[PDB]
From a paper:
At gene promoters, RNA polymerase II (Pol II) assembles into a preinitiation complex ([name]) which includes the coactivator Mediator. Here, we describe the [name]-Mediator complex from yeast at unprecedented resolution and provide a reference structure for initiation complexes. Moreover, we observe three Mediator-bound fragments of the C-terminal domain (CTD) of Pol II which stabilize Mediator conformation within the [name] and significantly extend prior information from the human system. We reveal two stretches of the CTD bound between the Mediator head and middle modules, as well as one CTD stretch at the Mediator hook domain.
Here, we report the high-resolution structure of the yeast [name]-core Mediator complex that we could stabilize by addition of the +1 nucleosome. We therefore prepared a 16-subunit core Mediator complex (cMed) and bound it to a preassembled yeast [name] that was extended by a +1 nucleosome as recently reported. We obtained a stable [name]-cMed-nucleosome complex that was suited for structural analysis. Single-particle cryo-electron microscopy (cryo-EM) analysis led to reconstructions of the [name]-cMed complex lacking the nucleosome and the [name]-cMed-nucleosome complex at 3.0 Å and 3.6 Å resolution, respectively. In the nucleosome-containing [name]-cMed structure, the nucleosome was oriented as observed before in a [name]-nucleosome complex lacking cMed and did not contact Mediator. Therefore, we did not obtain additional insights into the interactions of the nucleosome with the [name] compared to what was previously described, and do not describe the nucleosome further here.
Residue numbers in the entry:
A (entry chain e): 1 to 112, 159 to 302
B (entry chain f): 2 to 190, 194 to 210
C (entry chain C): 3 to 268
D (entry chain K): 1 to 115
E (entry chain l): 542 to 586, 620 to 703
F (entry chain L): 26 to 70
G (entry chain F): 12 to 35, 62 to 155
H (entry chain B): 785 to 1224
């Protein structure tokens, strides 16, 4: 049960390369290009559910999300084969134009036998205790290794759990594994739709500095990671503002 | 290779060692002990339509690197909880969170308003015996009310000559006065682990 | 054979009277307890009431219906409902009975256990039939109906043991006696003037030699030669009560062996 | 209201074993075995038939509270005799005695022709 | 991890007899004899060890009982013929041939004697009924 | 709308909200609500 | 309401019986520094009373339960009361007792110097 | 009783006429409407669970209907016309347009606001739905809108109670207003804590329940339904209990009813002769066997049927706990009664016992942190509680003294604050000061 | 109210013996002890179930049914 202590920030598109150089100097590690297609599934509205669970406690309906790494051949628009895969690729991705259209994601979901590995994540609202200076969130995570059968498609599999597809988004970014086990992502976010792709992070990069801790009861480890995150905010202080986002934004539960 | 599953529904609690001494001259070596718990989830939707089953079977092999398979309407879900067998791409891009949780814990914690656990069949402290180009894995299954039956898992490295091995094990089981076992070799469609879990599902159902 | 010895004195449809010799007191008492409590039996476990215009309460009727003895010859072939993959009950783990009685007569209409009708599929087993012992052919009197009153309900019979509820007990009263002459002195007889005449001799005193009144107390003698009369409720034959009790005790001891061997290899 | 269900007098709950064996530090070569979901029926049988073993120095059982269907069985054996093997031999002899009793009851019941 | 000199001497003698066991079982398994490691006997009749070797072409539940005896000086091997059965997870010598036993020296066993033993053992098993 | 039974006539009557609570056959002003049509489960212990 | 014939006695209710019969200095001043009896002339017992022991154990356990530093080595002990009793056993509780004499004067007895005889 | 909708009603399943009976109770119709059951009673110190008027009652006999009883509780409700538009209505309320709905369920109600007979109910479930209109355009509790034209006046079930709706009775009162009566039926199965008495003043509760295989048993296989203690007999000198058990044993064997009228010429010796004629020890003793081990008990046990009565004091109607709950409007102390989730009286002489123990802080915690902890401000000049405190603005002021810098807060019981304000109403000044003025 | 199915003490089924007990009483003119012994109730635990039973159900049956079909 991973607790995710994270901070968030934003930069413009013009300050991207300066931030890459700055975090290369701070980390000592070069940026690594990464991508992940995240498909978010909501519970079936046609199914009458109970507010209670198998236990006598009340449970709200929560969207759950699957993620996997799309190969970068699907994200190059037949102009960047000569350019090597590094942090300079994200300079080109400015508009809504992404080679990953809706039909290729439907081909990925419907698997048109055995499926690619996925990562199912369930996240609740971050804690409301106003004594923590970082956004602390709980993520229930599992890895779908493979699938088979006549309904091996992950869409029908997720329909098997009672979950329907709501939306999906593609994020491409660069990340730094820094010192003391801190991961610093710097990502664009595109929403994939039938009407066309939409760049959510329009003309800017979403910044996420997170540390994953396995045990939520290790208060020493929690405080150590929080001090590391506040330290990183202190070196980045003045240049870029890192702050705890609103908990209402990180609430993935279905409202009604 | 290929696998088949024999589940003697009604055998004595000491049939496992009785079957072991039946294969006294065929065992080459004994590997590490293994175990498995079998779970069954019933869908708790108050208004379910037709053409959909309410039963989902969760099969967690403690061997094959701590892997859980979910079966519903002949559809599989190979799911892991170990940190070792995560693909490096899933942990590199941050889609994974370093260490995962078992899908049984997710279903019994964050999905209990849809699926509740009904039956748990913990076949623990099993043994692995190696025949001539074969691997029999004997275990005693246990529901809530004590003994349930003897579960035999057949595994071969190859698959060219496999049904003769199944016939030999069936003849050995008939030699120890057990005639009403429910064998199963049905595959899906096709991984080995998912097919083994499906064979467990057909073996444990009647 | 060498071991415990059985000599049956009287055998009946619902009674067996036997002498259990060459056996310890713990084994005989454990057999008595297992027969009382640990033998699986079929009994009505859940009653779904559709119509009840009788003068009896619904759960009054349900408690009466649970206590109706049902045939349990093939109760091994049934499964526990908690061990079954069905949602509530099915033919693999339960027997579904029904009861539809109506007061169409001017006089009072008695509702008997013979009016219970099996509607589930028995698949050729020998369970679920209510046990009839009296000469009239009616069963246990379940309810009484005046004119116009109706009772429509559905029973689900599930297997259980008498530890869960006494309705699953097939053993009635089990007589049990050892040393009818008090030669082991396990009782110190209360008396006013003479314990020999104030205490009536049991019927099992005829099967043992009376003490000679001059011989010393035998301190080495242990308790054997148990006089047991088992009475069957009717769900299973009384010899099957004894045999299934021995089998259940054997299964418990084998389970102890199984647990010890599993944690021995780990 | 507070009455427990009647099935966990004999059903193992989640995450509990039928037996658990703890070494007893008061006496050498002695263990204490806790039998879950049993009562006096098995305890008296095992204890009184363990005492027939010549290599068992101590055998006693107790149900500490009638509310909970469990008992603790303390076995102390002579040196070189593991009390686990004493329990195995005791249970095996009880199995053999019950099997002989069952077969004798079949023979004597089949001798009855008035039933 | 040997504390006393007597402990190290016992460990050395155990290493000697285990080396003899290993070289014999590698000899026979490289030949093709399905040597068994799942079988233990309380006593097979100094510190000694026993090998229960078999080749799966002569009658079931029979094995060639190889018993080695080891000391600081002199170490020989006993070639016994016996029938071992498994009953309820326990191995019992249902038959043993203690009469026609020969004790060959360790420094004389070769692959040729293994060939001779393989050609002899099936006849020896047949003659034991 | 909802089924009611008079106290002594035992005749099933349907009453709406605007109707006065009386028996159309007896005029007896005590009426009993009808038993529920749904099946009710009784654990036979 | 209720109507029970099992007579339950109404406790704390003697007012019925009450209404049935209704007719028939030199050494120390103010709060100066003089109030403290000095250590050399303390006249109270050197033994720590059962009430002093109970309140020191309670106060120390309340502090230990509120993340106070612990001046003894823990042997896997978890309960704050048992940690407090272990601190009291080897005299590592940094508290004092102000024993008020009836005239308002007091003696300061440290927990370290008090003898735990009970 | 089925056509009587009484407020409370207890009906045994299986009334038994007594084996030992008086000639007088024929005219009392006691053999026609009995009030107890002939239970096979052993007088034995079996396991120590029947000490000090406890009893051990057979769990297997309980399973077969021994002392099982029906319990009926009727709930009354009416709709009353206070004025013209302020009238109550039996209907099923909805959360959209009704204020202060109870958090229990309303799904079991019908369109008339009444639950149908036969429906199982649990604790704090609404069985009668009633709504009264309210004044529109108010602002209460925050969750107030113009949609809420009514408020909930529904009748829930008792929180500890549950059962089956047995009969629902719609009718009109004398005034013509419709009023309903709902009868809920439940069964009280005997358990540890239910009070049982013989016909001789020998009351007691079930200490424990044993099953049949753990009970002591005679050579005939008879086990008691009830084990009572021998120590209940000699100090109370209840010889008639023993004579009843002997006479009931004889009556049950002979198939008659024992004449247990007081001043007849019926002796213990005649009953003992009759009991000996039936093949039993004449004084009622039976050689019984220990149920755990099968061994003969060294003492022989007085054994036989005795008429026992199930008393109305069940433990489940008396068990009560409260961690926090509603407070009274006046004293702001925990309310009285387990029906209203009340608190337990920590009386004056309980306080005296804690004083004698020397537990000052526990006494303070009982009187303050467990009942009523009130923070009130006083000024240093006058000891009165007449300080206007604005904690959001951090402003304090006592008018008259006109001081804003000499304010103290104290923690007193709310009953103490009420006492002081009542004393100010009687023109008495209970001035509270935080510093001494005179020496000790 | 109506005859219990099983004896409370031992569990012998006595609910089927009630009408035969009444028949042995009123048309065979037997006394109650011989009637109980004729039905096979030899333990007084079983004898007191039928002997002391008051059968109140027909008193309940004299009232008209509340719901008449
Ligand atoms: Mg008292
Ligand atoms: Zn089923
Ligand atoms: Zn009418
Ligand atoms: Zn003032
Ligand atoms: Zn104010
Ligand atoms: Zn009886």
């Amino acid at each position: 049960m991973v607790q995710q202590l994270s901070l968030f920030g934003s930069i413009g598109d013009d300050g991207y390369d300066l931030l890459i150089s700055t975090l290369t100097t701070i980390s000592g590690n070069p940026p690594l290009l990464y991508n992940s297609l995240c498909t978010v599934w909501k519970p079936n509205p046609s199914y009458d559910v109970e507010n209670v669970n198998s236990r006598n406690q009340l449970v709200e309906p929560n969207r759950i999300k699957l993620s996997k790494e799309v190969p970068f051949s699907y994200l190059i628009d037949e102009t960047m084969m000569d350019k090597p895969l590094n942090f300079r690729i994200l300079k080109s991705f400015t508009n809504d134009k992404i080679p990953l259209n809706y039909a290729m994601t439907r081909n990925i979901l419907h698997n048109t036998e055995s499926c690619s590995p996925w990562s199912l994540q369930i996240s609740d609202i971050p804690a409301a205790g106003n004594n923590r200076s970082v956004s602390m969130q709980t993520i229930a995570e599992t890895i779908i290794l493979s699938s088979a059968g006549k309904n091996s498609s992950v869409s029908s599999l997720m329909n098997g759990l009672g979950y329907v597809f709501e939306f999906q988004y593609l994020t491409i970014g660069v990340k730094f594994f820094m010192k003391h086990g801190l991961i610093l992502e710097l990502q664009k976010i595109w929403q994939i739709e039938e009407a066309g792709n939409s760049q959510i992070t329009s003309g800017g990069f979403l910044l996420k500095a997170y540390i994953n801790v396995s045990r939520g009861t290790d208060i020493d480890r929690i405080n150590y990671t929080e001090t590391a995150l506040m330290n990183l905010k202190k070196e980045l202080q003045g240049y870029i503002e890192l702050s705890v986002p609103d908990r209402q934004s990180m609430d993935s539960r279905v409202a009604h | 290779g290929k696998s088949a599953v024999i589940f003697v529904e009604r055998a004595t609690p000491a049939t496992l060692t009785e079957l072991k001494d039946a294969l006294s001259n065929s065992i080459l070596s004994v590997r590490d002990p293994w175990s498995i718990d079998f779970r069954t989830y019933r869908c708790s939707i108050k208004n379910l339509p037709a053409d959909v089953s309410k039963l989902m079977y969760s099969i967690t092999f403690h061997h094959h690197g701590r892997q859980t398979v979910l079966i519903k309407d002949n559809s599989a879900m190979v799911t892991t909880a170990a940190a070792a067998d995560i693909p490096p791409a899933l942990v590199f891009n941050g889609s994974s969170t370093g260490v995962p949780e078992s899908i049984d814990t997710i279903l019994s914690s964050k999905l209990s308003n849809i699926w509740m656990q009904r039956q748990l069949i913990k076949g623990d402290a099993g043994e692995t015996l190696i025949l001539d180009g074969l691997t029999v894995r004997l275990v005693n299954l246990f529901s809530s009310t004590g003994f349930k039956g003897l579960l035999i898992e057949l595994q071969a490295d190859e698959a060219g000559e496999f049904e003769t091995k199944i016939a030999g094990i069936e003849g050995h089981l008939a030699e120890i006065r057990a005639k009403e076992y429910k064998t199963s070799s049905d595959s899906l469609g096709s991984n080995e682990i998912c097919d083994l879990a499906y064979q467990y599902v057909r073996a444990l159902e009647l | 054979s060498e071991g415990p010895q059985v000599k049956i004195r009287e055998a009946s449809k619902d009674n067996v009277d036997f002498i259990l010799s060459n056996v310890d007191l713990a084994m005989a008492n454990s057999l008595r307890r297992v027969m009382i409590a640990e033998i699986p039996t079929l009994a009505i476990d859940s009653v779904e009431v559709e119509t009840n215009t009788t003068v009896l309460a619904d759960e009054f009727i349900a408690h009466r219906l649970g206590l109706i003895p049902l045939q349990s010859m093939d109760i091994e072939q049934l499964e526990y409902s908690r061990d079954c993959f069905c949602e509530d009950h099915c033919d693999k783990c339960s027997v579904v009975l029904t009861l539809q009685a109506f007061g169409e007569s001017e006089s009072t209409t008695n509702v008997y256990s013979k009016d219970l009708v099996i509607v589930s599929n028995l698949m050729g087993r020998n369970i679920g039939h209510p046990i009839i012992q009296d000469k009239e052919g009616n069963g246990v009197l379940i309810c009484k109906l005046r004119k116009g009153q109706e009772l429509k309900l559905t029973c689900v019979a599930k297997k259980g043991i008498a530890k869960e509820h006494a309705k699953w007990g097939p053993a009635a009263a089990i007589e049990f006696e050892y040393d009818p002459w008090n030669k082991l002195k396990h009782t110190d007889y209360w008396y006013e003037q003479d314990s020999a005449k104030e205490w009536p001799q049991s019927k099992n005193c005829e099967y043992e030699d009376p003490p000679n009144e001059g011989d010393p107390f035998d301190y080495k003698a242990q308790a054997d030669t148990f006089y047991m009369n088992v009475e069957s409720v009717g769900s299973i034959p009384v010899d099957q009560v004894v045999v299934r009790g021995i089998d259940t005790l054997q299964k418990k001891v084998a389970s102890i062996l199984l647990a010890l061997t599993q944690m021995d290899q780990d | 209201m507070n009455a427990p269900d009647r099935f966990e007098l004999f059903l193992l709950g989640e995450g509990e074993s039928k037996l658990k064996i703890d070494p007893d530090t008061k006496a050498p070569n002695a263990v204490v075995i806790t039998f879950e979901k049993e009562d006096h029926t098995l305890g008296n049988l095992i204890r009184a038939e363990l005492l027939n073993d010549r290599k068992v120095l101590f055998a006693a059982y107790k149900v500490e509270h009638p509310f909970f269907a469990r008992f603790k069985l303390r076995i102390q054996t002579t040196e070189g005799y593991d009390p686990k093997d004493a329990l195995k031999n005791a249970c095996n002899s009880i199995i053999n005695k019950l099997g002989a009793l069952k077969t004798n009851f079949e023979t004597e019941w089949n001798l009855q022709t008035l039933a | 991890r040997a504390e006393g000199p007597e402990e190290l001497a016992r460990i050395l003698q155990q290493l000697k007899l285990d080396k003899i066991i290993h070289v014999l079982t590698t000899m026979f398994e490289n030949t093709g004899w399905s040597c068994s490691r799942i079988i233990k006997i309380d006593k097979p009749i100094l510190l000694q060890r026993d090998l229960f070797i078999r080749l799966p072409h002569w009658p079931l539940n029979w094995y060639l009982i190889l018993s080695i005896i080891s000391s600081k000086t002199s170490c020989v091997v006993e070639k016994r013929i016996g029938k071992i059965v498994s009953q309820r997870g326990k191995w019992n010598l249902k038959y043993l041939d203690n009469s026609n036993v020969m004790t060959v020296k360790l420094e004389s066993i070769t692959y040729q004697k293994i060939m001779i033993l393989q050609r002899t053992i099936l006849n020896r098993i047949i003659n034991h009924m | 709308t909802l089924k009611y039974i008079c106290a002594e006539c035992s005749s099933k009557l349907s009453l709406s909200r605007t109707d006065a609570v009386r028996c159309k056959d007896c005029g007896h002003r005590i009426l009993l609500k009808a038993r529920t049509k749904r099946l009710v489960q009784f654990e036979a212990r | 309401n209720e109507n029970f014939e099992d007579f339950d006695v109404e406790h704390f209710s003697d007012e019925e019986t009450y209404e049935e019969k209704p007719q028939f200095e030199q050494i120390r001043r103010k709060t100066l520094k003089e109030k403290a009896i000095p250590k050399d002339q303390r006249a109270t017992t050197p033994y720590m009373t059962k009430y002093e022991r109970a309140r020191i154990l309670g106060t120390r356990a309340l502090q230990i339960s509120m993340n106070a530093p612990v001046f003894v080595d823990l042997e896997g002990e978890t309960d704050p009361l048992r940690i407090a009793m272990k601190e009291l056993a080897e005299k590592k509780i940094p508290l004092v007792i102000r024993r008020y004499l009836p005239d308002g004067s007091f003696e300061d007895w440290s927990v370290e110097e008090l003898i735990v005889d009970l | 009783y089925n056509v009587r909708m009484d407020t409370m009603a207890n009906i045994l399943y299986y009334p038994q006429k007594p084996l030992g009976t008086t000639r007088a109770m024929e005219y009392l119709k006691f053999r026609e409407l009995p009030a107890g059951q002939n239970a096979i009673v052993a007088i034995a110190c079996y396991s120590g669970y029947n000490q000090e008027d406890s009893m051990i009652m057979n769990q297997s006999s309980i399973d077969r209907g021994l002392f099982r009883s029906l319990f009926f509780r009727s709930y009354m409700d009416q709709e009353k016309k206070y004025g013209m538009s302020i009238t109550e209505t039996f209907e099923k309320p909805q959360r959209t347009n009704t204020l202060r709905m109870k958090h229990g369920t309303y799904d079991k109600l019908d369109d008339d606001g009444l639950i149908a007979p036969g429906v199982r109910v649990s604790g704090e479930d609404v069985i009668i739905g009633k709504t009264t209109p309210i004044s529109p355009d108010e602002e209460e509790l925050g969750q107030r809108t113009a949609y809420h034209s009514k408020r909930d006046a529904s009748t829930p079930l008792r929180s500890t109670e549950n059962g089956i709706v047995d009969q629902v009775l719609v009718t009109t009162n004398q005034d013509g207003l419709k009023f309903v009566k709902v009868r809920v039926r439940t069964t009280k199965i005997p358990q540890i804590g239910d009070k049982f008495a013989s016909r001789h003043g020998q009351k007691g509760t079930i200490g424990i329940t044993y099953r049949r295989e753990d009970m002591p048993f005679t050579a005939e296989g008879i086990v008691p339904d009830l084990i009572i203690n021998p120590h209940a007999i000699p100090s109370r000198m209840t010889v008639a209990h023993l004579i009843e058990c002997l006479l009931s044993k004889v009556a049950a064997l002979s198939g008659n009813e024992g004449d247990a009228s007081p001043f007849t010429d019926i002796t213990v010796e005649g009953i003992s002769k009759l009991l000996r004629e039936h093949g039993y020890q004449s004084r009622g003793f039976e050689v019984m066997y220990n149920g755990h081990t099968g061994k003969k008990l060294m003492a022989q046990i007085f054994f036989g049927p005795t008429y026992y009565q199930r008393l109305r004091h069940m433990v489940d109607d008396k068990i009560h706990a409260r961690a926090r709950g509603p407070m009274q409007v006046l004293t702001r102390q925990p309310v009285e009664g387990r029906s209203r989730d009340g608190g337990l009286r920590f009386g004056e002489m309980e306080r005296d016992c804690m004083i004698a123990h020397g537990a000052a802080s526990f006494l303070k915690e009982r009187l303050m942190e467990a009942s009523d902890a009130f923070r009130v401000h006083i000024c240093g000049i006058c000891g009165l509680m007449t300080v206007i405190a604005k904690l959001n603005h951090n402003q304090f002021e006592c008018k008259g003294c006109d001081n804003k810098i000499d304010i103290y807060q104290i923690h007193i019981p709310y009953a103490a604050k009420l006492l002081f304000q009542e004393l100010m109403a009687m023109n008495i000044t209970p001035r509270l000061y935080t510093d001494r003025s005179r020496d000790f | 109210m109506i005859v219990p199915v099983r004896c409370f003490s031992c569990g012998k089924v006595v609910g089927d013996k009630w009408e035969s007990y009444l028949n042995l009483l009123q048309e065979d003119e037997l006394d109650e002890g011989t009637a109980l012994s004729r039905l096979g109730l030899k333990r007084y635990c079983c004898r007191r179930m039928i002997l002391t039973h008051v059968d109140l159900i027909e008193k309940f049956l004299r009232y008209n049914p509340l719901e008449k079909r």
